[PDB]
Design a binder for this molecule. Structure first.
Ligand SMILES: Nc1ncnc2c1ncn2[C@@H]1O[C@H](COP(=O)(O)OP(=O)(O)O)[C@@H](O)[C@H]1O
Ligand SMILES: Nc1ncnc2c1ncn2[C@@H]1O[C@H](COP(=O)(O)OP(=O)(O)O)[C@@H](O)[C@H]1O
Ligand SMILES: [Ca+2]
Ligand SMILES: [Mg+2]
Ligand SMILES: [Mg+2]
Lengths: 126, 371, 160, 74, 371
């Protein structure tokens, strides 16, 4: 087929994928806030005797400890995963890289300048 | 911004922006003051013509190269050459461009330190990095192993590399190069009657060497043939007429590479220093070095050298190993192409010697981690 | 590549007639009726620009698929606009890689052609099943039935 | 011991995260403020753990990609 | 689920899932850091190549075994080897698989305790069990009695067993093994001119030993024959050419097994420590041990050892007893095949050291009832 339609397809796919990924990320953030507020529950016990206040404080200190231990273990595991992922990435590159060196061209100077230089003095309209 | 990949060399300065295929401006590195008196007034006569301008007025100049053997012997002239290269051949002020010089292996430290001090104080570049001239030539071939013989015009050096790990104890640097071949050719031309003495006529002898000389596959047979027939005598027209005829001087000039006893040097030829450089390497990477022998540099452009060298090494090496000699057609600019590739890499972008680092440690920063 | 074909399809008879007149003026006296690789290279060297003869061979192979070294009108315009390579760098790599990775909604490491079908329905560009088939052929080099991530890099390589 | 060092390091991070919850001497509003501090810490850790989960899902899919390419590189 | 039958060994790590015939992945246990500088940027050079990868880049590495004589001397490297074995050669996470390591007899306790602590804390296996390397080799032969001589690469040990009841007072462990034979061969090759020094060239000498050496049936006659004729001189091509010719070094290298005085060791050969191990047993099970002598381990693969050993023992033993030497063709992997058989048994399924048990008693659980 024509190549212009193919380029239009390519850029349209770029836009489609970008917009869908962005909307998915937005939904992830919204659900993150929603579910976390559903998990972290606000309290209100002002004016109470300091015994109950301190009981709540100790309970929430323990809860802080639990959440910190869990999340920090998860973060350590995820960091290990990311390290292993990087190792595999390097391995696959070394297996299939090498030839991966790009080439840059500055020889292709502006074509209008080329036309001007060739036509010399007669380079008036082109 | 873009990086400036300069390459001082010795005989031809090659420069250009990083990321292209060929250097933008290539011109001899000679600075020649006029030597006669000068009677016309107001002719606009300068005090020193550098670069390619002094190859056109060479009739009344005394050209003198500022780089003898890799090392730089005349710092003022080298500064003048760099200033010309930046401002007139590229027309880019150095205040806005990183630079990537190149240096031969085993050179004096003071040369490198003075080079970085000049680049940081006079031209005031943002950041400069100095690289060994052989690793770049290995970049350009797209390999990652191999032993590269970079026979420039100043000095011939032979750096073996395996899997990206250079072997510092196996670098064999020999000071025979194109300039000594020019002098020897100028010395053997006197056997027919042609005397070239002036420093300007050295350029004519260099042109003769480039256009006519070739490396013989077998030396004795060629010496016997040239002494009986006359099928070798090729003629050449001087810059004023009076054609000359070169006989068996054709393959005797570049033969000095394989027998440095001709110019009185003791060492062994470029065919045997490569084998010695290989044999110093470990016993398990010798096959790969045998199979990936790389040629570079200008002087390895003689017609018929990639066969003579292969024959010699095959004679020296064990009979089982395969000897292959990589001789790309873009040999002359191989170092600069490799320099462009290296400067265009993203992984390399943090190895430059930033100016604040130089301000904190002085010119001796180049020997440190930022090599 | 066909990038310049798309660029000249963007262009109209103005560029066609302008380059036709440029041919009439400068290629005047040439016995060709087109522009040869050698002629183009020599003329470039005459003006000052010195591309490699390997580039001449590459360009002639690209525009002149028959290998004649000449330039048919469409491929002539493609070759002429090939000199001015304004658009480079091929859009973004890692972000587009993430977009393609999320394109595998099934997340099996396989990009079904039906996901592409839905995305094209979203685009709605004038395309038939044979057209998307041909595009996938241009993309699915190994013919694994999907869009390979390396082949995803390949088909979007240099693509803005 | 490197593994001893890891276990001790995680335990020390745990110990560091344990603040001095000696607050009974304070008044009601200050105790409310401290409870809010703990609550905010918990919710922030919740956000961090959510990010960990989504990024680990991405890590797993990319390891699938890596393994597929390993299969491709036969 | 399935069990992982790993077998650390010393020289070759053999691993695979329980219930098969042969180990899935067999690769040398060496970890070699690079030793040169390295000039190519972005080549993706790692800091330590382990396993079979470091047998291909050994030209620029310094290979060092993490297990000297059965015992483990460098715990970080051993952990690296285990991590490689689990993740890259088998690609099974250890969180879902029991493991069955193997250990030589009479080894230091701290080695075994550290091994179990690593397996439970770092890799976090569900349950692991440590077994003596000779009982497995007896499993693989399908016997239930017999005295097994397991001459590995690290240490040679000789465990007699009767009717399933091991005799702990009759285990004779000797520290001469394949590695000492490699060193002695490398030391006697110098008598012809070939010098191997680098830790990489030890691998080449090991290959020479594997492919050429053989055990002589009678030592003096072979020494006399090799000194007159030349029918023994077998040649071998190094990794770069320059073939070498091994004369009477062929049967002198493995002769060290039967005369440990060659490498200065005091003890008696493997032909006499077996007889001593038998004579320590009770007087009524000596006939069965005589008739069921089992060979195992890599180093017992020399061509012609099953006859020399039988001749020697028949010389030592009383004339009436029948001496039979079991030498299965699958000698090298005999220990691992036995390990697979043992791990596949239903009766054995409750002997594993479950993780909760380790949590309650610490690493010293291994010396307890769960042996
Ligand atoms: N085509 C050629 N044939 C033979 N010799 C050549 C040719 N071109 C250059 N040379 C020699 O090589 C030298 C140029 O070498 P070059 O690679 O520029 O040195 P550098 O490493 O300093 O750049 C010249 O002096 C000349 O003697
Ligand atoms: N075919 C062979 N011939 C002679 N010696 C061998 C042969 N195969 C292996 N060996 C020797 O045995 C050693 C391997 O022994 P192995 O049984 O793997 O030890 P481990 O008990 O540690 O696994 C090697 O180092 C080598 O020296
Ligand atoms: Ca998909
Ligand atoms: Mg050079
Ligand atoms: Mg063993």
């Amino acid at each position: 087929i024509s190549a212009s339609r193919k380029l239009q397809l390519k850029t349209l796919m770029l836009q489609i994928a970008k917009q869908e990924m962005e909307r998915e990320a937005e939904e992830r953030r919204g659900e993150k806030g929603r579910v976390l507020r559903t998990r972290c529950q606000p309290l209100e016990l002002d004016g109470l005797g300091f015994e109950e206040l301190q009981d709540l404080c100790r309970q929430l200190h323990a809860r802080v400890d639990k959440v910190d231990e869990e999340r920090y273990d998860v973060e350590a595991k995820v960091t290990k995963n990311i390290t292993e992922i990087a190792d595999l990435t390097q391995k696959i590159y070394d297996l299939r890289g090498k030839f991966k060196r790009p080439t840059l061209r500055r020889v292709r100077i502006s074509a209008d300048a080329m036309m001007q230089a060739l036509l010399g003095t007669r380079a008036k309209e082109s | 911004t873009t990086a400036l990949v300069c390459d001082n060399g010795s005989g031809l300065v090659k420069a250009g922006f990083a990321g292209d295929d060929a250097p933008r401006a290539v011109f001899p590195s000679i600075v020649g003051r006029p030597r006669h008196q000068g009677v016309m007034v107001g002719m606009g006569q300068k005090d020193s013509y550098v670069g390619d301008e002094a190859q056109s007025k060479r009739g009344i100049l005394t050209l003198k190269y500022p780089i003898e053997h890799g090392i730089i012997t005349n710092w003022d002239d080298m500064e003048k050459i760099w200033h010309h290269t930046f401002y007139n051949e590229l027309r880019v002020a150095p205040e806005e461009h990183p630079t990537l010089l190149t240096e031969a292996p085993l050179n004096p430290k003071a040369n490198r330190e003075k080079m970085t001090q000049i680049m940081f104080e006079t031209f005031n570049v943002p950041a400069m990095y100095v690289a060994i001239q052989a690793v770049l030539s290995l970049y350009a071939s797209g390999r990652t192993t191999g032993i590269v013989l970079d026979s420039g015009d100043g000095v011939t050096h032979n750096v073996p590399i395996y899997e990206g790990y250079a072997l510092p104890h196996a670098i064999m640097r020999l000071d025979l190069a194109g300039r000594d071949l020019t002098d020897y050719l100028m010395k053997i031309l006197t056997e027919r009657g042609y005397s070239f003495v002036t420093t300007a006529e050295r350029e004519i002898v260099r042109d003769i060497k480039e256009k006519l000389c070739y490396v013989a596959l077998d030396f004795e047979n060629e010496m016997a043939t040239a002494a009986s027939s006359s099928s070798l005598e090729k003629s050449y027209e001087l810059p004023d007429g009076q054609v000359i005829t070169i006989g068996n001087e054709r393959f005797r000039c570049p033969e000095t590479l394989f027998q440095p006893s001709f110019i009185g040097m003791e060492s062994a030829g470029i065919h045997e220093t490569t084998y010695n450089s290989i044999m110093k390497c470990d016993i398990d990477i010798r096959k790969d070095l045998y199979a990936n022998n790389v040629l570079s540099g200008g002087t390895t452009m003689y017609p018929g050298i990639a066969d003579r060298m292969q024959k010699e090494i095959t004679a020296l090496a064990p009979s089982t190993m395969k000897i292959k000699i990589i001789a790309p057609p873009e040999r002359k600019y191989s170092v600069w192409i490799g320099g462009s590739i290296l400067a265009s890499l993203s992984t390399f972008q943090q190895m430059w010697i930033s100016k604040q680092e130089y301000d904190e440690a002085g010119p001796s920063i180049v020997h440190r981690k930022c090599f | 590549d066909d990038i310049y074909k798309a660029a000249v399809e963007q262009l109209t008879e103005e560029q066609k007639n302008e380059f036709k007149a440029a041919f009439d003026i400068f290629v005047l006296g040439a016995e060709d009726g087109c522009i040869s690789t050698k002629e183009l290279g020599k003329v470039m060297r005459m003006l000052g620009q010195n591309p490699t003869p390997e580039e001449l061979q590459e360009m002639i192979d690209e525009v002149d698929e028959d290998g004649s070294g000449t330039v048919d009108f469409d491929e002539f315009l493609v070759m002429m606009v090939r000199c001015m390579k304004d658009d480079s760098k091929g859009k973004s790599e890692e972000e587009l890689s993430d977009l393609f990775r999320m394109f595998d909604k099934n997340a099996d490491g396989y990009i079904d052609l039906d996901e592409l079908k839905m995305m094209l329905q979203a685009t709605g560009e004038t395309i038939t099943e044979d057209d998307i088939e041909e595009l996938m052929k241009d993309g699915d080099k190994n013919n694994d039935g999907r869009i390979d991530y390396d082949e995803f890099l390949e088909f979007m390589k240099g693509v803005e | 011991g490197k593994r001893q060092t890891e276990r001790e390091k995680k335990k020390k991070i745990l110990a560091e995260r344990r603040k001095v919850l000696a607050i009974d001497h304070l008044n009601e509003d200050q105790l409310r403020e401290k409870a809010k501090e703990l609550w905010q810490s918990i919710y922030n850790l919740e956000a961090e753990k959510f990010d960990l989960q989504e990024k680990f899902k991405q890590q797993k899919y990319e390891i699938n990609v890596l393994r597929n390419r390993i299969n491709d590189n036969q």
